[PDB]
Symmetry: D3
Subunit: 145 residues, 6 copies
């Protein structure tokens, strides 16, 4: 069902995206926040390949099944902390940038909880997962069953 | 914070929705399809109260964590059988009836995998969860948070 | 043409939906509000089968042609009372729950004109017509001409 | 409350739109089609001022209450002829031009039932009502209310 | 070809009627800068390459900068536009997308801060006019010169 | 007007995004296609900061004002070659991945005009500009005004 084996067709292009990924992982952001960014953006973008991966990674790091399962419907779930909600609002707004334009309210709420350095790391992370989602959905990557 | 305790505010209205729910549960549809309908519609509708409930019920009935977790992004997931995909296409179209109008392609794909009787049961089940989602989101029902 | 004669294919399922309909009818909500709920939701949902029925029902109960004809465009019509506008805002938000998430403003406006008991009955009624619309559009039910 | 009395604020601009309206009216298009175009576009655009007007005009020319009331939901209504359906598809596509881009299928179906000359008349008529809708909604024009 | 209908040939009378409204707008007294802005922005929203091509050329002829022309597709985030131009653009966007927005109070009041009621009527008729051209040109797949 | 000077707030994160950018620039794709990808995606995403930049880069590389100005409305413009149209359909589908899910028809059309290797470079380039647009709109970056 896969369209292109992208890692084989252009190894260097793949490695360039992976370099950005490796930066994200080592950026200093709490792993919990990285998991959240990756899982939530992948849900918005319909990327089963990435959702499968990030569910597994979140579980391995001890995040609860509720935290994982409710991520698709976070706005109405009391699971998430105020800081997590601030982050999720930004993940949503920025993932859907063409629609939302990244509103003042979402940014202000994020600023209450994070430094500008952290916000840059968060936003680069959102960009990175948005790239993987585009590659994986675009090329119909198939997750393991 | 909850807006209204609807079971208290109107016991009779609550009972009426519970009667429809009771019909769906005893309708004859495979449990697996009932869980799928309820979980997928709840995700589309943004209903955390129902998603929490239906994840838990799905788990109780032995559905895998992958089947549960991937429901939000089923189109791109190889987890679901062709029959499940037919059902999911219909849950999606019918939950979003105003936008999709329930197209011939989604209906024809469903008809390939289910009898007309089953299709009526499925469609009533979709209506039922759409009602619960509207009640729960509308009244800001709060799901339990685990320890 | 009709996809499925649903009352014939599953009499028990049809009976269950009619049971809910029967509750709504006897719920004690003013019938003017039941008509409004049914007509407006059916318009939003594109359900000609139900619009045809509820137009005729509204007329039978002596609601004016303007009240009926303007329901598709109520926001800009001075026909509707403040209480009706509060109800219409809720019908719209709840019918489009996936888009709107039933906002605070719509809820508080509704609370200003209806008791909590009435609000529960209203919201169950919105659910009920949303079910009928899904069945009728879903099975391509044909209204009489 | 009305925002601007536009006829008073700029009589010249008002007259210019009225001249286009006069063209549409005497264009040769069947009055039933003119009514249909005006009523349907007005519903899409949320223009109560124009819907009120065009409901009354349609009624005056003997169109049925069903024809009038089902226009908001025409796709699922058997009241409309195949020709009317072809026209309605185009009214919808062109009224929502930014979303649809006026697709080949909608144009092909229209072409089945109308000459190129008629299509130009139709499309100018769609443009004209789209202008009135923007003026009326834009300036919050208030329709009369019958007791 | 790529064109569906040669509309000026198929109905000269209908063409003349739309041109008459266009000729009103041109003569209306609105600053030509604002006329260009209304036409260019609405055409972009509506996906009308036929009109975008024409109105880019007209704007350039009247001495509007390449930035002013090119950033019109993404004006909300561009410091190019004056506060008055932004007020107008907000209204062009809201009214062009009337079915979605309903022409909100905020957009109207902001416009009111920069234009007289008479000017607002001329502006709104102008938005109507371009919205008509866009529907004709996209509808008929009119092809701009290359 | 600016929310965050991202290069100053996190030099390390900036360097990481620049590394991906430097790959794209030297990927071997024809610069015309790189400009097209960057300009179109930026228009879709409402990013004035990137549109301003990519308009200027396209002009420097000799692309016509028509090719630049019509990108916002490409579907209806005869300026673009069939190969460019194939690419544009993919840029649009993938930029709006949540809405479109990258359909078979768009992919097959792209395949008719580009090798699998090129398609990978193209899609990475789409991801890259989508990241820049999120950063610039997200942080309200302000482009220079001439």
């Amino acid at each position: 069902k896969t369209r292109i084996n992208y890692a084989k067709a252009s190894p260097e292009a793949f490695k360039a995206v992976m370099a950005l990924e490796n930066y994200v992982q080592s950026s200093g952001l709490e792993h919990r926040f990285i998991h959240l960014i990756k899982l939530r953006a992948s849900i918005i973008n319909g990327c089963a390949f990435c959702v499968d991966m990030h569910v597994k990674e979140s579980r391995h790091d001890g995040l609860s099944e509720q935290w994982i399962n409710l991520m698709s419907v976070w706005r109405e779930s009391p699971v998430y902390t105020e800081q997590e909600r601030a982050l999720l609002g930004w993940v949503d707004a920025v993932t859907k940038i063409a629609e939302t334009g990244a509103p003042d309210d979402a940014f202000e709420t994020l600023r209450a909880h994070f430094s500008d350095e952290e916000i840059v790391k968060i936003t680069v992370a959102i960009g990175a997962i948005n790239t993987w989602n585009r590659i994986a959905v675009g090329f119909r990557s198939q997750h393991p069953v």
